[PDB]
């Protein structure tokens, strides 16, 4: 049809904010790896994007590459917008075509395209895939691929090689003529190498040649518990849309036990119940108060909330999920019409104007249901005109105007304001100092930014915003003992300082470097000419080694910043002499004091211990060990005093009671601003500023906070502009010397009328009370059962509290039980909590309402009755089989691990951990080490099923790969693939576990 059109392709003009002039490229679709491509010649393909990650294709110049461009001369209809990625802000390919005619043929074309990519079978995904990996080495869309080559893929594709033997003990069984392999050649390997490494599996099942018609039928019906698998012809179609053979599709299908194998890996076996991706009308004619509404806090930021970039497209993003409730915070712009940005911070405006046509175009696409528009008004009178204008005018028919019943005593149901937008703002009755300022660091000889705020007469600050050539590198020690280079880096206080030595005895080298006040070390051996960090950490040089760990972190979040050098021992040295008057300590803040006290993880000892190792921690009986992480067996891990979570032996604490909970509330850390960003904290009271008269250390613009109490060090702060220099000079030198709505927008508030009245009796169905996340907190401690009973009639909104500047979520579990309605999240994080949110709203079919069980409207519900009262309706018991395609986060190949988890209010961190597999993140195997785990259910409706996959890095820190999150109401059982998602709960392309899970009701 058009498809060979696009696949044969269209000479276009492509549009980048990033690049300043339009660029002409031909756009083509390559079906074999089913991606748009972009080429300025035919040899090479210049940029490439997937079609699986296509999340719109809107028609027009709107988007952030038009916007940004100079002119745009081609018309609106030749234009269009690709967004597509795997993050919460996506990546748009901005295309003007020469003619109407093609840019209307590609909007066609690639909707069906991209159908056909979503409805696709795993065997044809795969074989893009292996597809997408020959084209990626030397990008000439290759035909075949050399053994050097595939050697140089299979640690891109997180698989170690064993061995030499391996691959071309392999290679001959595959049929290696050459050291060439065609691509069915290497089709054939992938299957061998996935089959062989997995093979083990098998002895679960049955002991046939293969598996036939019959005993996949069986499989189906008995252990996956499908009971349309009776028609037997419904089976025999599933094999065939599988497999896509038609020489065996000829009669009766059969699998080979390998092709059964990808099958329990595949899509088509999720452990995901379909049922549930579809809307149930039955489920949405409640009043709006019985319903959790998918919520979005500040919904126009994109990063941290301190100088990230306000944009549409998160509206759009977080509306497109089927997010109900968005945030305005509408500031006076300069022109009489309202700006929208976090207010006194170095967020990025945009205009309101933009905000309200954006939820126009995007509010009621993928969701028809009711969306919730939270206004934080701080315009004036006349502002607040142009913003009830502005909703009537935009919006017309879709602005709730008047209430759905005149006589009603409760609210609406979703059904009954379906297309409708409801405002939240204040209804008529019947300053701070801060933004970014660099800081000198004496050791490393440079300035960096850091956003710093004053709140109550204290500037807190933050963390920065971002042949053997290692011989002549004053870095590298060449006879340099272990104990020395502990003792050399004991003397720089700075995480990130480091120096590489060669190893004594050994042509082999170490990198040790300081981290959190304590000297690590990492062995570096040599592959011939390559350098190995740790096991598969590959550096043709040390200098590389250093450059990528300076760009990326290599223990945690730490990097490579401070080269340990004979000049920089010698020079801090006498500078530690000349500023001895004074301790540095006191302007920086401990790591701890910034991390709060775990809500349950707290132990209290039983007995006296004294460590028989350093590894092992030493403590007195009744000694508080705090931020426990339980393992099997003897041996917990846990901080008391200083150290961080060292071992003790478990059977020598015991649980804290209420008693001890007084002392904890004494060791809650005192919130600042920044509050996880926060680096160090200076009491202006005890300081004056000066103005250096000619700057300091090369920067033009520097004041300096001189002490006025002994040893309290003097700190200096550099601007880009004398103005910024003078604002801070004058805000600092005052502490160191020491209500109007407008009638038009008040009148579109019919319901979420914002309250106070002090506390939650008499709740009226038109009034919306908020609170903070710590009010929030405090509530469900004190009156659990007053924020229920206000809910079922009343509507409750809970935002992040201020000091939550990394953007970072809160738990919703205990609200969400106690039957809050909006408890708004920063969609724009990648963390637990979002995923939880996003798990929640795949329910009812992403229309972001979910209808509160029945259980929490009887007189009998109780969230959280005693331990032995506990009703357990369900038992679940889990086992982490393997799992195929795990992404590579860093250089090295991926050990990783599966955490298993039941996630909600009445589980105290309910998890167990499969034991790790060395350098395979491609084919893990869990299946051999350990038996299944079995979890108690009180209520299945209230709680979720949680799978993260970690690697195990050299250091034994877990880092972040997948998770899969899912209502335990749409689990199914038997032998089911785990679908695995990144941190935005976006798809990793092939990534799944395979599980077997058992429900007992
Ligand atoms: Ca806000």
Redesign the pocket.
């Known amino acids: 049809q058009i498809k060979r059109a696009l696949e044969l392709g269209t000479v276009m003009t492509v549009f980048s904010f990033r690049k300043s002039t339009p660029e002409r490229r031909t756009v083509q679709v390559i079906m074999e790896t089913r991606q748009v491509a972009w080429s300025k010649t035919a040899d090479k393909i210049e940029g490439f994007l997937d079609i699986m990650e296509i999340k719109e294709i809107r028609p027009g110049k709107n988007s952030k590459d038009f916007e940004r461009a100079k002119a745009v001369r081609q018309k609106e209809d030749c234009c269009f917008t690709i967004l597509y990625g795997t993050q919460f802000v996506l990546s748009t390919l901005s295309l003007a075509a020469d003619s109407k005619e093609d840019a209307v043929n590609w909007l066609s074309g690639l909707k069906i395209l991209h159908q056909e990519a979503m409805n696709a079978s795993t065997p044809t995904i795969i074989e893009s895939w292996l597809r997408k990996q020959i084209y990626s080495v030397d990008q000439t869309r290759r035909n075949s691929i050399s053994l050097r080559e595939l050697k140089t893929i299979l640690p891109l594709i997180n698989f170690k090689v064993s061995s030499a033997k391996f691959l071309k003990d392999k290679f001959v069984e595959i049929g290696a003529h050459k050291d060439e392999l065609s691509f069915e050649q290497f089709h054939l390997f992938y299957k061998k190498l996935m089959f062989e490494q997995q093979k083990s599996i098998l002895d679960e099942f049955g002991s046939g040649s293969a598996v036939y018609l019959h005993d996949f039928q069986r499989f189906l019906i008995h252990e996956q518990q499908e009971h349309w698998a009776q028609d037997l012809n419904k089976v025999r179609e599933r094999m065939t849309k599988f497999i896509d053979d038609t020489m065996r599709e000829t009669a009766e299908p059969f699998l080979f036990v390998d092709e059964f194998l990808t099958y329990l890996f595949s899509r088509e076996n999720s452990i995901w119940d379909e049922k549930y991706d579809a809307v149930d009308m039955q489920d949405m004619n409640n009043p709006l108060s019985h319903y959790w509404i998918s919520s979005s806090?500040?919904t126009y930021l994109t990063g941290d909330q301190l100088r990230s970039e306000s944009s549409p497209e998160a509206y759009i993003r977080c509306l497109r999920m089927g997010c109900r409730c968005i945030?305005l915070?509408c500031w006076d712009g300069p022109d009489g019409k309202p700006v929208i940005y976090?207010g006194w911070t170095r967020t990025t405006k945009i205009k309101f104007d933009d905000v309200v046509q954006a939820i126009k175009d995007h509010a009621f696409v993928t969701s028809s249901f009711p969306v919730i528009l939270?206004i934080?008004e701080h315009c004036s009178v006349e502002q607040q005109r142009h913003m009830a204008k502005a909703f009537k005018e935009v919006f017309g028919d879709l602005l709730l105007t008047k209430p759905t019943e005149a006589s009603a005593d409760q609210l609406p149901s979703p059904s009954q304001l379906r297309e409708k937008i409801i405002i939240k703002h204040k209804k008529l009755g019947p300053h701070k100092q801060q933004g970014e300022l660099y800081m000198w660091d004496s050791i490393d000889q440079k300035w960096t930014r850091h956003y710093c705020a004053i709140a109550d007469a204290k500037l807190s600050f933050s963390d920065d915003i971002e042949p053997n050539p290692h011989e002549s590198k004053p870095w590298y020690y060449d006879s340099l003992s272990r104990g020395e280079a502990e003792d050399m880096l004991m003397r720089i206080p700075r995480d990130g300082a480091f120096l590489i030595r060669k190893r004594e005895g050994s042509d082999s080298y170490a990198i040790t470097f300081r981290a959190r006040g304590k000297v690590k070390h990492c062995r570096i051996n040599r592959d011939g000419r390559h350098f190995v960090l740790g096991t598969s950490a590959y550096f043709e040089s040390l200098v590389e080694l250093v450059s990528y760990y300076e760009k990326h972190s290599l223990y945690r979040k730490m990097r490579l910043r401070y080269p340990v050098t004979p000049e920089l021992l010698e020079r801090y040295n006498m500078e530690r002499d000349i500023n001895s008057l004074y301790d540095v300590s006191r302007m920086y803040v401990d790591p701890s004091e910034i991390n709060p006290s775990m809500p349950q993880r707290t132990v209290k000892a039983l007995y006296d211990y004294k460590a028989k190792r350093s590894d092992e921690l030493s403590f007195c009986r009744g000694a508080l060990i705090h931020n426990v992480s339980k393992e099997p067996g003897g041996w917990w891990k846990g901080d008391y005093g200083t150290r961080i979570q060292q071992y003790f032996p478990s059977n020598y604490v015991e649980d804290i009671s209420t008693a001890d909970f007084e002392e904890l509330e004494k060791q809650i850390i005192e919130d600042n601003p920044l509050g996880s960003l926060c680096r160090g904290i200076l009491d202006l009271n005890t300081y004056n500023v000066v103005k250096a008269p000619q700057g300091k250390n090369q920067k033009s613009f520097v004041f300096i906070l001189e002490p006025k109490q002994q040893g309290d060090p003097p700190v200096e702060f550099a601007t880009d502009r004398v103005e910024e220099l003078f604002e801070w000079f004058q805000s600092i030198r005052e502490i160191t010397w020491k209500q109007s709505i407008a009638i038009e927008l008040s009148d579109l508030v019919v319901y979420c009328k914002p309250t106070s009245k002090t506390n939650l009796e008499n709740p009226d169905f038109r009034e919306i009370r908020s609170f903070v996340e710590t009010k929030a907190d405090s509530i469900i401690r004190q009156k659990p059962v007053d924020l229920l009973k206000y809910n079922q009639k009343g509507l409750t909104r809970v935002?992040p509290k201020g000091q939550r500047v990394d953007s970072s979520n809160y738990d919703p579990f205990r609200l969400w039980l106690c039957g809050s309605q909006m408890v708004a999240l920063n969609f724009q994080t990648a963390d637990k909590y979002m995923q939880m949110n996003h798990a929640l709203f795949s329910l009812n079919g992403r229309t972001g309402y979910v209808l509160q069980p029945e259980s929490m409207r009887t007189e009998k519900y109780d969230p959280m009755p005693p331990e032995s009262q506990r009703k357990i309706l369900m038992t679940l018991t889990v086992k982490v089989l393997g799992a195929r395609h795990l992404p590579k986060l860093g250089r090295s190949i991926a050990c990783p691990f599966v955490e298993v988890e039941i996630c909600g209010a009445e589980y105290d961190n309910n998890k167990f951990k499969t034991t790790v597999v060395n350098d395979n993140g491609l084919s893990p195997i869990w299946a051999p080490t350990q038996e299944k785990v079995t979890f108690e259910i009180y209520d299945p409706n209230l709680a979720f099923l949680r799978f993260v996959v970690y690697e195990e890095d050299m250091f034994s820190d877990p880092n972040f790969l997948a998770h899969a999150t899912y209502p335990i109401k749409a689990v199914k059982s038997g032998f089911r693939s785990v679908p695995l998602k990144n941190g935005y709960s976006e798809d990793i392309e092939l990534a799944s576990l395979l599980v077997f899970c058992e429900m007992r009701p």
């Open positions: 806090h500040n945030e915070d976090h939270s934080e935002y």
